[PDB]
């Protein structure tokens, strides 16, 4: 309607106040709204990358996004002086500090990883806080610990830069799929952190899964890694079964309850309501006693060292420091009792933080900045991929290969634009490398930049003029090898079709790359790639026999959440529409046998399991009984309570 | 109604390798959405559910003709067109 | 390349596989060795590949000239003759250059070997092998999309550059339909330039894969007008192409369209399952029996109008009565039936209670007897309808209708987009107080008939579309532009500054989902069902199917409609009598609820009213169903 008439193009000139998420998308002017919405969702679906790189083609609004998002870095807002450092573990310690200006006392804790939810989290770069010792000084702006997304100069990058080409690789790119080289797969690796809790009571005992005959360890130490994908296993102890089951405590038995997780331990916390003396007696829980004494000694240290600070009347302590001191003092205090879910628990409860590096796998989704979703179809050797063997760029290989069929139909031209600009940037860098004069190099660079974005050209002129000759040489060399930054702001300052036309007509030498064994000359160029959360491990499920509901029908269990099982074991539902589609086969008897043996009837299920367990493995023929199904029994009872009874005519 | 012809040798790889021509009949794409698998064990059940095999759906039931859903997808079409035209 | 190949000899020989593989290896190696050259002009470069070279093929003692790639594809498609050791027949040959005919070949194959299971296995084998070779061709002969392709084609052909840089003239006023026609003309020219010159995108557009004309034209040339969430055409169009750039107003329009698409998808996710569930639950119990004649009366065979070619296309493997009085098959190719009304044996008039006979279903019976018939029908109807609905609303399109404004209006006013402008800013616009009525959707006042006085003359104008007066003039309407004696509003156009619109109107485009919605309504709303009879509901169904583009044979639709109707006698044998028995057609929800099957009614909808009240006569239901076994 005419309401949109209020929108005046002159009012929003040189303005980006209407853009929000789209600010991270270069050439947002050219992308369609659907792909932009997909990008906004992808930014949430993104995962932290171990080898995060600043974008080659950027909007310069990215570092602002990184700064104002507070979950990745920690900044000591005031000037501080390190009062003390106390170690809980080698991976986790605590720093007590004091504001030099205000005089208040505050606290800063470190850890190797931070967990967000489920199996999602990230590793930390704790080198700045680890360099700090007692009586050192923290400035007003200092990154005590940072994520891998931020580099040394606080530049923020949510993904990697990968050399891409639009190619049809043996029809492995049908619809939208990506084939990626192993070297590029290394750059697309992420972190996986899990907080798994194993609860032990007086009935159950741990098993010597880790160690030898002299050393009894039921769980890995802090530095150790997980073996056989089992954090621990527990056996219920009863005097009747103790004579035979307790012997060979080192090996697993069918009665044991195992707990599955994979990675490296980084923090273990044990809460024990058992008397410490009884643990001293028990050999199987000796490691638990050792870690309990470690936590108690750390709390004793913090009490002894911060009593003067907390209990000094003419002193100010932050609420965080006060709560920390109070919790540690409660833990060292006598008659302390721990409750889980508002219930006093028997035995103890152990919480493990486990960190691993998970790489790129088939079925994992990686996308660009323009809604170009893709599923990794094949991870191939980097040699068995398009290689160019003509010209100066010989030996260059494509890191990823994308589907070229419907690039125009997806209404996302910015993908092609970024690829083209990085492709011509390759030629600019090569021309710079061939020249032997630094002035010639900066002249070529300023020419290309002025052709793309003029403001970046002015800023680079200022930056180069300010640099020392050695610093300028380092700048030039790293630009030649690593790549040149090009700025394509989302809405104003982007490079359009006519600007690219001018660029292509000026640089007459630039032409399509001729690759080995490929008739069509194609273009390879760096584009930005981010990794999405959806993965083959996310929704994988495999159930044969699992826990049955109270009604005798299969149902899901919380075992996968509690890390008691490796895969989901979640039952699929056969919908009513699925029944209709299956009814195409007029063998309703076979469909009813399927549903009865798999779910409705217990006798048919037991018969099926027995036939598959004993008999001929290669030829399986089953005979099923005609006993009424449990679903029919429940129906009969419900209708009986209604006062109606279905009877066959 | 499909057949397993290979067991993948990698524990990390957890993806059903399905043929491309099967996409149109499933009315699905490689967007990562999960497909459900129900194994059939009984031999009689195998012969009964074989009516859902791709061969029985090769003949389009509307016209009694060949079903284009099992024909070449657009990329295979591009390849064949380059070859023959 | 050996210049001459004997087709039947290669097919019968046991060296067939190695010969196919040798030809394939030669072709792929030669393609890897050579590089493709694009002239980007009307003339075509001299690219010599092994696939392009001609060869002579000896089939049944006759020489046919085909390409080498045609030969290897023909060997792949001729697996049945090596399997069965039967000579290749010249009638089992076609233009291997045209892909559309491939399906036909396969169909003929299925008919030539009697729909054997082995020939079906061979078809699947040919599909697999052809797909593998397609992958080989694609990896060796690369496919790529890039902007430099379009830029180079524009360098060689200036018309391409003029079209890529085209902009609608803002100097002169243009109506919406003229904008749409401009878009269509320029897009057709773009497609013609892409097809007539040797560009890197020629194979895409000529193969029909990877290029959609509308989307690609939006990428290259102007995007055009885009609709609102409520289906109202937004006045300001998108002049610049996505590649050329966009404006903030255009960005708002685009984001609004994307939100509309997401909302549509969300709602259709919920609607599709309900519709298909109802229809499947009703048609699940349709059966078939192997009886040649059911005794159905020839007069009882209902009639259908062969209005156009699509209606004739619906009926294949279908019988009809000639003028001799004998049942005879219908041949779709014959045009003599057009413009006539033909009475046909129909499934709805079948007189067998056990199941549909071979006559009422047609010759398709033997083909579909393996699967359940009603399920085939419901799936064939429900898949294209839902997919078309979703795709049509996801593809935001503008359908502007031409408006005949009138001689007085056109000679005294000027219309541009949604804006009405006075030609001269003089005279007074009089509007009767009662004619300022209220529009429901607008919630504001609109005037449809106004009289403008200029000089000595008083002209009267009636607008085809409702007009919203400008805000500034409406603000001062009651204060100074009203004469109480005459009960009319007199607005001086002299007060309006130049370039200010006199009024504004809203225009709603004709959405592409209306016939599909009419299908759904006819199935559910029961508006057309209660007043009309079967002979007209089948014609309405076929006409709406043609309007929607859904290709489903009328036999399945006849089954769908048959299951909805309920005989007052509830006996099929009454159809054997002279005249049509008493019946009543119901909606899909009422059909199974008012039906005689307990399981399909209890397991469907409204369990409470069925068990508590006898309105559905649930206790009297005794008919059986396969769904009974699930209970
Ligand atoms: Zn009949």
UniProtKB/TrEMBL annotation, chain A:
Q: Taxonomic classification, please?
A: Viruses, Duplodnaviria, Heunggongvirae, Uroviricota, Caudoviricetes
Domain DNA-directed RNA polymerase subunit 2 hybrid-binding, chain residue ranges per copy: 291-547
Q: Which residues cross the membrane?
A: none
Q: Which GO terms describe its molecular function?
A: DNA binding; DNA-directed RNA polymerase activity; ribonucleoside binding
Q: What is this protein called?
A: DNA-directed RNA polymerase
Q: Which organism is it from?
A: Bacillus phage AR9
Report the top EC class in one word: transferase
**Which Pfam families does the UniProt record give?**
RNA_pol_Rpb2_6 (PF00562)
Q: Which domain of life is it from?
A: Viruses
- InterPro entries documented for this protein: DNA-dir_RNA_pol_su2, DNA-dir_RNAP_su2_dom, DNA-dir_RNAP_su2_hyb_sf
- Give a Gene Ontology cellular component term annotated to this protein: DNA-directed RNA polymerase complex
Enzyme Commission number(s) from the entry = 2.7.7.6
Q: Report the family membership.
A: Belongs to the RNA polymerase beta chain family.
**Record's keyword terms, sorted:** DNA-directed RNA polymerase, Nucleotidyltransferase, Transcription, Transferase
Annotated catalysed reactions? RNA(n) + a ribonucleoside 5'-triphosphate = RNA(n+1) + diphosphate
> What processes in GO biological process is this protein linked to?
DNA-templated transcription
UniProtKB/TrEMBL annotation, chain B:
What fragment of the full-length protein is this? 342 to 426 of 426
Query: What is this protein called in UniProt?
Result: DNA-directed RNA polymerase
Question: Which species does the entry assign this protein to?
Answer: Bacillus phage AR9
Automatic annotation (TrEMBL), chain C:
Read off the Pfam families from this record: RNA_pol_Rpb1_5
Please name the GO terms that the record assigns under molecular function. DNA binding; DNA-directed RNA polymerase activity; metal ion binding
Residues bound to Zn(2+) 2 are: 357, 360
Q: Give the top-rank taxon of the lineage listed in the UniProt record for this protein.
A: Viruses
Q: Where is the RNA polymerase Rpb1 domain?
A: 245-566
Keywords from the named record: DNA-directed RNA polymerase, Metal-binding, Nucleotidyltransferase, Transcription, Transferase, Zinc
EC number of this enzyme: 2.7.7.6
First-level EC class: transferase
> Which residues bind Zn(2+) 1 per the record?
294, 350, 357, 360
Q: Which GO terms describe its biological process?
A: DNA-templated transcription
Instruction: Kindly list the GO CC terms recorded for this protein.
Output: DNA-directed RNA polymerase complex
- Name of the protein in question: DNA-directed RNA polymerase
Q: Origin organism of this chain? A: Bacillus phage AR9
Q: What taxonomic classification does the UniProt entry list for its organism?
A: Viruses, Duplodnaviria, Heunggongvirae, Uroviricota, Caudoviricetes
């Amino acid at each position: 309607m005419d309401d949109i008439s209020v929108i005046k193009n002159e009012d929003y000139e040189g303005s980006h106040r209407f853009l929000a998420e789209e600010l991270l998308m270069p050439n947002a002017n050219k992308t369609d709204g659907n792909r932009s919405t997909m990008f906004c969702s992808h930014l949430a679906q993104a995962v932290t990358l171990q080898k995060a790189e600043p974008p080659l083609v950027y909007t310069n609004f990215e570092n602002q996004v990184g700064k104002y998002s507070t979950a990745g870095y920690r900044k000591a807002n005031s000037n501080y002086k390190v009062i003390e450092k106390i170690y809980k573990n080698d991976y986790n310690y605590v720093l007590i500090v004091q504001d030099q200006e205000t005089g208040e006392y505050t606290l800063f804790e470190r850890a190797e990883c931070e967990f967000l939810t489920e199996h999602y989290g990230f590793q930390w770069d704790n080198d700045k806080i680890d360099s700090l010792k007692k009586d050192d000084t923290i400035e007003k702006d200092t990154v005590l610990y940072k994520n891998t997304c931020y580099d040394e100069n606080m530049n923020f990058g949510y993904g990697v830069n990968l050399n891409a080409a639009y190619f049809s690789y043996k029809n492995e790119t049908l619809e939208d799929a990506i084939v990626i080289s192993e070297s590029a797969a290394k750059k697309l690796g992420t972190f996986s952190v899990n907080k798994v809790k194993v609860s032990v009571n007086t009935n159950d005992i741990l098993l010597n899964l880790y160690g030898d005959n002299e050393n009894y360890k039921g769980f890995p130490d802090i530095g150790e890694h997980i073996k056989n994908q089992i954090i621990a296993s527990r056996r219920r102890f009863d005097y009747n079964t103790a004579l035979y089951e307790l012997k060979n405590l080192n090996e697993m038995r069918d009665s044991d309850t195992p707990f599955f997780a994979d990675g490296k331990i980084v923090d273990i916390e044990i809460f024990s309501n058992v008397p410490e003396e009884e643990l001293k007696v028990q050999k199987y829980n000796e490691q638990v006693l050792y870690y309990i004494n470690k936590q108690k000694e750390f709390s004793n240290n913090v009490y002894q060292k911060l009593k003067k600070i907390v209990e000094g009347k003419d002193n100010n302590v932050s609420d965080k420091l006060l709560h920390f001191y109070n919790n540690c003092k409660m833990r060292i205090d006598e008659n302390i009792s721990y409750t889980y879910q508002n219930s006093k628990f028997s035995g103890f409860i152990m919480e493990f933080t486990i960190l691993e590096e998970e790489p790129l796998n088939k079925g994992s989704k990686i996308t660009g900045r323009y809604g170009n979703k893709g599923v990794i179809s094949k991870i191939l050797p980097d040699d068995q991929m398009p290689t160019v063997a003509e010209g100066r760029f010989k030996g260059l290989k494509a890191d990823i290969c994308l589907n070229p069929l419907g690039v125009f139909n997806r209404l996302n031209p910015s993908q092609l634009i970024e690829q083209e600009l990085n492709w011509i940037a390759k030629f600019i860098r090569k021309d710079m490398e061939e020249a032997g004069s630094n002035e010639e190099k900066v002249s070529i660079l300023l020419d290309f930049l002025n052709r793309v974005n003029k403001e970046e050209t002015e800023l680079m002129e200022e930056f180069i003029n300010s640099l020392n000759k050695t610093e300028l040489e380092e700048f030039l060399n790293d630009i030649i090898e690593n790549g040149i930054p090009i700025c394509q702001k989302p809405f104003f300052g982007n490079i359009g079709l006519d600007e690219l036309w001018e660029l292509y007509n000026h640089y007459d030498h630039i032409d399509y790359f001729k690759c080995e064994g490929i008739s069509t000359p194609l273009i390879i160029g760096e584009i930005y790639m981010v990794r999405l959360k959806h993965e083959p491990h996310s929704k994988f499920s495999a159930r044969s026999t699992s826990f049955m509901n109270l009604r005798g029908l299969p149902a899901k269990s919380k075992n996968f959440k509690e890390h008691k099982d490796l895969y989901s074991k979640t039952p699929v539902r056969i919908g009513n529409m699925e029944i209709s589609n299956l009814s195409l086969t007029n063998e309703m008897g076979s469909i009813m046998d399927m549903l009865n043996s798999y779910s409705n009837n217990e006798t048919n299920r037991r018969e099926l399991i027995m036939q598959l367990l004993t008999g001929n493995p290669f030829d399986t023929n089953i005979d099923l009984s005609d006993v009424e199904s449990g679903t029919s029994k429940i129906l009969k009872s419900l209708f009986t309570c209604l006062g109606l009874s279905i009877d066959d005519v | 109604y499909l057949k397993i012809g290979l067991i993948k040798k990698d524990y990390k790889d957890l993806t059903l390798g399905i043929s491309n021509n099967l996409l149109s009949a499933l009315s699905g794409d490689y967007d990562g959405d999960v497909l459900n698998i129900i194994p059939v064990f009984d031999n009689k059940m195998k012969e009964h559910f074989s009516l859902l095999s791709p061969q029985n759906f090769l003949v389009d039931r509307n016209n009694g003709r060949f079903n284009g859903d099992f024909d070449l997808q657009k990329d295979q079409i591009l390849g064949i067109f380059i070859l023959n035209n | 390349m050996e210049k001459t190949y004997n087709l039947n000899d290669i097919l019968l020989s046991n060296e067939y596989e190695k010969i196919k593989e040798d030809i394939k290896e030669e072709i792929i190696n030669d393609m890897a060795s050579k590089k493709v050259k694009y002239s980007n002009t009307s003339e075509f470069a001299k690219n010599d590949f092994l696939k392009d070279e001609f060869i002579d093929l000896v089939v049944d003692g006759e020489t046919y000239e085909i390409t080498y790639g045609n030969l290897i594809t023909l060997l792949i498609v001729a697996r049945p003759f090596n399997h069965f050791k039967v000579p290749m027949t010249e009638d089992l040959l076609f233009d291997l250059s045209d892909l559309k005919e491939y399906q036909n070949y396969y169909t003929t194959l299925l008919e030539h070997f009697g729909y054997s299971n082995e020939i079906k296995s061979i078809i699947k084998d040919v599909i697999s092998e052809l797909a593998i070779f397609s992958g080989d061709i694609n990896v060796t002969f690369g496919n790529t999309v890039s902007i430099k392709s379009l830029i180079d084609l524009g360098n060689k052909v200036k018309r391409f550059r003029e079209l890529l840089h085209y902009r609608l003239p803002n100097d002169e006023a243009l109506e919406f339909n003229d904008i749409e026609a401009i878009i269509k003309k320029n897009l057709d020219e773009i497609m013609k330039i892409l097809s007539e010159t040797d560009n890197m995108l020629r194979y895409y557009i000529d193969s029909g894969a990877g290029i959609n004309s509308k989307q690609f034209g939006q990428v290259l040339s102007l995007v055009g007008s885009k609709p609102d969430l409520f289906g109202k055409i937004i006045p300001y169009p998108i002049n610049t192409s996505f590649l050329r750039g966009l404006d903030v107003r255009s960005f708002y329009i685009n984001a609004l369209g994307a939100r509309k698409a997401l909302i549509t998808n969300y709602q259709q996710v919920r609607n599709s399952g309900y519709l298909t569930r109802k229809i499947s639950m009703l048609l699940m119990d349709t059966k078939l029996i192997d009886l040649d004649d059911c005794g159905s009366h020839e007069n009882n065979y209902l009639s259908i109008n062969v209005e156009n070619k699509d209606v004739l296309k619906r009926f294949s493997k279908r019988s009809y009565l000639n003028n001799n009085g004998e049942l005879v098959e219908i041949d779709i190719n014959d045009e003599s039936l057009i413009g006539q009304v033909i009475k046909i044996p129909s499934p709805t008039t079948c007189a067998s209670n056990e199941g549909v006979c071979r006559k009422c279903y047609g010759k398709l019976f033997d083909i579909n007897k393996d699967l359940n018939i009603g399920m085939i029908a419901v799936l064939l109807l429900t898949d294209p309808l839902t997919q078309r609905l979703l795709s049509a609303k996801h593809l935001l399109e503008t359908r502007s209708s031409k408006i005949d404004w009138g001689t007085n209006f056109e000679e005294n006013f000027i219309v541009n987009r949604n804006l009405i402008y006075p030609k001269v800013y003089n005279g007074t616009v009089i509007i009767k107080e009662d004619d300022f009525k209220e529009d429901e959707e607008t919630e504001e006042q609109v005037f449809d008939t106004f009289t403008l006085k200029s000089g000595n003359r008083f002209i009267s104008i009636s607008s085809p579309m409702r007009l919203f007066l400008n805000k500034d003039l409406k603000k001062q309407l009651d204060e100074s532009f009203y004469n109480i004696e005459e009960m009319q509003f007199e607005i001086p156009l002299n007060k309006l500054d130049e370039g200010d619109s006199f009024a504004t109107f809203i225009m709603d485009n004709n959405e592409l989902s209306k016939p599909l919605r009419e299908i759904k309504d006819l199935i559910e709303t029961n508006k057309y069902i209660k007043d009309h009879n079967v002979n007209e509901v089948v014609n309405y169904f076929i006409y709406l199917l043609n309007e929607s583009g859904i290709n489903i044979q009328s036999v399945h639709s006849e089954l769908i409609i048959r299951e909805m109707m309920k005989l007052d006698d509830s006996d099929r044998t009454q159809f054997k009598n002279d005249k049509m028995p008493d019946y009543e057609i119901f909606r899909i929800t009422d059909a199974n609820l008012k039906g005689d099957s307990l399981s399909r009614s209890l397991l469907f909808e409204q369990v409470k009213k069925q068990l508590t009240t006898l309105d559905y006569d649930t206790f009297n239901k005794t008919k059986s169903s396969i769904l009974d076994k699930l209970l």
